[PDB]
Amino acid sequence: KAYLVGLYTLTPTHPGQPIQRERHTGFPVIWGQSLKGVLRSYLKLVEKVDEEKINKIFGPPTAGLISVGDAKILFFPVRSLKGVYAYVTSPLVLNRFKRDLELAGVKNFQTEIPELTDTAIASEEITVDNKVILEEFAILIQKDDKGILESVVKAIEQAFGNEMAEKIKGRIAIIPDDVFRDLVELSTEIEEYIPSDTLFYSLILVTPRAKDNDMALIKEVLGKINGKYLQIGGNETVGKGFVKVTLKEVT
Incomplete structure (x- = not known):
């Protein structure tokens, strides 16, 4: 019913100029929309999952079975x-x-x-x-x-x-x-980057209306993300934005 996602930066990462930050704290955040796009583009190009399966779980990039939350900093x-x-x-x-x-x-x-x-x-x-x-x-x-x-x-x-x-x-x-707060604001890699060895966490929640046939598909597709490596943000061509992704099912 719920999946926990870990994002560990292997390279300086700029999600997207200043980086994206939460208003009332100043904490850096990876926007749920951005992460959702990074995930579905990964399953499409790298893992090569069918267009229809992805369109059912994420929905057209505009109607999806799951919800991809914002990624927050747990360790800096x-x-x-x-x-x-x-x-x-x-x-x-x-x-x-x-x-x-x-x-x-x-x-x-x-x-x-x-x-x-x-x-x-x-x-x-x-x-x-x-x-x-x-x-x-x-x-x-x-x-x-x-x-x-x-x-x-x-x-x-x-x-x-x-x-x-x-x-x-x-x-x-x-x-x-x-x-x-002061550290994560002033100890950023400097264009402002999020330094390597930063651990983000995100929530993937399944819609309550999901049938059991949907549950199996979500499990099958999202399981192909655990322990994999993704690209997030700008300046990919100079070896930046690479993250180790973990996806554990919540019981």
């Missing part, structure tokens, strides 16, 4: 003094991730996420003298009594796969929302 790569770089997230981002999971039907991720104002919760591999040095900023670490990092890593594994989990594991740093 920031230069770290220890561990070279860190995957940076915030309580707001993680809470949105929970909220979108509940919208998808997931009741697994219910771990309490502490509000952070002056402290961070990071892995040992990126921490020095009880601190995490992201670029210029220096943030005092806070002990992980609730076992939040391990729960996050578990969530990543359940959501995007085991490889994605191992990739992020050891470099996670939950920081204040303001610091995250």
Whole structure:
């Protein structure tokens, strides 16, 4: 009934001049329309699925069985003094991730996420003298009594796969929302690009009126996207906009 999508940037990516951003936060987003077009053009040209099957699941590019949501940033790569770089997230981002999971039907991720104002919760591999040095900023670490990092890593594994989990594991740093906001606004690759090693997530929801014969078709076609590589945005000819795509079914 619902599919979760992961987008991991392998190259500097410009979805589309400044990049597309959410109004009231300043967070970079990949617009659902754009992602839907990237997906259906992939299944058409690369996987070579029939015109009719694609026209039934996505509908003509103007009447579709599924809905492709916007892709939001879950982890953003920031230069770290220890561990070279860190995957940076915030309580707001993680809470949105929970909220979108509940919208998808997931009741697994219910771990309490502490509000952070002056402290961070990071892995040992990126921490020095009880601190995490992201670029210029220096943030005092806070002990992980609730076992939040391990729960996050578990969530990543359940959501995007085991490889994605191992990739992020050891470099996670939950920081204040303001610091995250400032980073993702000022630590962009500069034409403004979204830096490599950025993890987006998107929701694919199936219409309630979908018959069971539709369910099988959606499963068959969308399954050909998991663990594949897609191109998103401009400047494709200079090796940019390449993303590893994961597609896990939600139970």
